[PDB]
């Protein structure tokens, strides 16, 4: 079609800015003090922060173009370009709260409400367009269904976010589930379903040539950090995509390494174990590869409850506790560590990249 | 209308909002070095800046709890048209004052603004075509795509124009609140005309504006505790053209933008560096008085163009700028200009002085408006 190719041009274009732009702007963001450390490397100077504001802002650019090609001589239809700029507000209040975020460091609580605010242009795309509420088993699930996919919004703004840690992690699983997702849109575009697919790619082909432009720089060596940014976008734009779209189960299935890293860092994240400011492996310097990271407790003071799920994980085998107590901090990347040893932070990157890969190959059998 | 008072009780919500969490989110600014030192005070302290963002961010939140208060049991038709109108103007606001929240950290380069401020004022040409699509000046011409540039140009020119016309404690805000106050009684007036969805439109964006900048306000107040910044200036302007554009009185409004068109005018000889112009043209303290004088633009002459040396022989001989002989310039900006025809002022009360002359404004506006004794 025309409007997928003139997409596809655009979103080409958009790459090469994106490339280009990053370079330009470094003096910018050191100049600000917008910029983190290589925790997981030797060296200690600076790196620019939050760079995925820059790609961000090319995405929504290049939307704000591509907007009226899809509606050349289209009584206008004026629900479709409802749900275009309703979810370029969600996604556009999405990088802005990230950019703020970095540069301020909210406070979870801050994080969540603004989240929750950002979503509801969601919400109301859904209800006015399209405002089914049921789910086979067939119940009516009713104002219970909006909250699902509020709280999946937020579930794909952080859960990405939680997964980082090692250099170009994020835009690397970000870019695994956009490909993911785009290829079963274009399967589905055949199908009885197609408007809602070609929706998907309309915001899922640029998403993934612009995240690209943005790991380019973001790949070991990591020359700059994407940050919350780039986080949150990804995770609305996701959400977007995958809610609109009436998929938003075969998406959470693609979310399938997301997920499992979610539930099973639950128990810090509740506070139940002790969450560190910082859970990610620690290199070694003898080594040159990545070790695993504990947090440290004095024992008794631990509530009932902890204790006893300590001991369950201890028991599955999932925790490497060495009783002060100090547990294995709990993330997949220090879980993959756990069970393979040391590794390189590249190679573990790679290898992360590629379990995400094969869950999009499970995924995909599932459906077909 | 239950619209209107629910919009005014989340609006007043809002203004609490906003002045209970300037304060708050204090630390995180001066924590992330987002500040600026008062060049118009002996102090050397740092001034958090960009608190407009807080302002901002509680004006999308209140409207983004407000969008369904419009339509209740509004058949099994909805209406997308007005709804796609509040929601692209809402990502043209938002898309503004991320804007201005990035600029401000990353103080970007002239070219830079103004392409992302055209970019971020698309959306709101994409409402107006597909929503009302008329493109005819009655003076009865068929602008054609021209309007459209018009309207574009329109936006990027209010977001700009309030802050050129800054540098004082209060007067981004201040003149703002007066601005958003004039076309709110405007918009009461003609809310009962033959135009009320427009105007009930304008009302939905300019109340809450009203009130957050409000909230802002009491903290920006002289003496300064907070700057509102590029975010609370492109804010406004964008709101503003927003209101104005889809409301069908962008002529009424730009005759609200007096004060700002005319210092906008007055400072294009150095905005477009034909007369050599500094990074800050505020007016500069006097240590000895306490009160705030002119300030100039001192430069070679040799270096000066035809055309500069041209429009400089021009306004001093109309009695607006002051010269001495290098050489230096008057600086061009209204608030140099007020201290020219006033001398040394005080902080406050120059800052005073121009709300009112805005209030002037709006009041000519008013009589031309509708054919009323001054
Ligand atoms: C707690 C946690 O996981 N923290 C992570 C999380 O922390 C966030 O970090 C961010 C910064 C981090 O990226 C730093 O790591 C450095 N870095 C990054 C790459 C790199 O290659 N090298 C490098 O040095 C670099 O300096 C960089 O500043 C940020 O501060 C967040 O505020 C911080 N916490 C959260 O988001 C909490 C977000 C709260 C999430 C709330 C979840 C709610 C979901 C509910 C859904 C449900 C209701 C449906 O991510 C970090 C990634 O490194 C982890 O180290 C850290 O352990
Ligand atoms: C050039 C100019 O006007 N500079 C101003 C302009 O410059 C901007 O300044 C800002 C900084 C200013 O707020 C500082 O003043 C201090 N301050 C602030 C309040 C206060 O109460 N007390 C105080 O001390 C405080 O430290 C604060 O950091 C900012 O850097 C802008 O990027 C800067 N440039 C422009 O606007 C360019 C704007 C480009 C204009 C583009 C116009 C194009 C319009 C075209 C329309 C057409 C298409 C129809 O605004 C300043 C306001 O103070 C002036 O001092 C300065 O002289
Ligand atoms: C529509 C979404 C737009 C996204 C906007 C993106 C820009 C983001 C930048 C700044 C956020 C500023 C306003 C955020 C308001 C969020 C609302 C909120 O969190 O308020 C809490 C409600 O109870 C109380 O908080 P409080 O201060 O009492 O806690 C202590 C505190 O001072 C510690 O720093
Ligand atoms: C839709 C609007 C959203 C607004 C987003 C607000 C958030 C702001 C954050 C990042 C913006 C960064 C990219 C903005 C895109 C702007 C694109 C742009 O201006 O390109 C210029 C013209 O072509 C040339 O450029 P260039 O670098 O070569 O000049 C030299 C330069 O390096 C001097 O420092």
Redesign the interface.
């Known amino acids: 079609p025309m409007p997928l190719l003139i997409n596809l041009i655009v979103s080409l274009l958009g790459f090469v800015a994106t490339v280009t732009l990053i370079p330009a702007?470094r003096g910018?963001?050191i100049?600000?003090?917008?910029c983190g450390q290589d925790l997981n490397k030797t060296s200690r100077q600076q790196i620019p922060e939050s760079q995925g504001?820059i790609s961000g802002?090319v995405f929504?650019?290049i939307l704000?173009?591509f907007?009226?090609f899809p509606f050349l001589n289209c009584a206008?239809p004026?629900?479709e370009?409802?749900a275009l700029?309703?979810a370029?507000?969600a996604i556009?209040?999405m990088?802005?709260l990230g950019?703020?975020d970095d540069?301020?460091?909210?406070r979870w609580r801050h994080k969540l409400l603004?989240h929750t605010?950002?979503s509801?242009?969601l919400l109301?795309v859904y209800f006015?367009?399209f405002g089914n509420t049921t789910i086979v088993v067939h119940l009516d699930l009713g104002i219970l269904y909006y909250v699902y996919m509020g709280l999946l919004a937020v579930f794909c703004t952080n859960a990405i976010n939680i997964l980082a840690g090692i250099n170009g992690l994020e835009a690397g699983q970000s870019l695994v589930i956009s490909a993911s997702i785009i290829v079963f849109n274009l399967v589905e575009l055949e199908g009885d379903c197609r408007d809602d697919h070609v929706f998907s790619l309309y915001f899922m082909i640029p998403f993934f040539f612009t995240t690209l432009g943005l790991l380019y720089h973001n790949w070991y060596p990591s020359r700059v950090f994407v940050g919350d940014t780039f986080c949150y976008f990804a995770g609305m734009t996701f959400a977007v995509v995958g809610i609109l779209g009436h998929f938003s189960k075969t998406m959470l299935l693609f979310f399938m390494p997301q997920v499992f890293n979610f539930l099973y860092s639950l128990p810090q994240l509740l506070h139940i174990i002790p969450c560190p400011r910082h859970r990610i492996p620690r290199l070694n310097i003898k080594t040159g590869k990545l070790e695993m990271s504990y947090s440290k407790f004095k024992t008794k003071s631990l509530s009932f409850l902890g204790t006893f799920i300590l001991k369950v994980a201890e028991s599955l085998q999932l925790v490497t506790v060495h009783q002060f107590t100090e547990c294995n901090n709990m993330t997949l990347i220090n879980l993959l560590l756990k069970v393979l040893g040391p590794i390189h932070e590249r190679n573990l990157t790679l290898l992360l990249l590629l379990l995400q890969i094969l869950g999009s190959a499970i995924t995909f059998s599932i459906r077909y």
């Open positions: 702007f910018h963001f100049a600000a003090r917008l504001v802002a929504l650019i704000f173009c907007i009226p206008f004026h629900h370009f409802v700029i309703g370029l507000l556009c209040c990088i802005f950019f703020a540069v301020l460091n909210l603004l605010a950002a509801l242009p109301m006015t367009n």
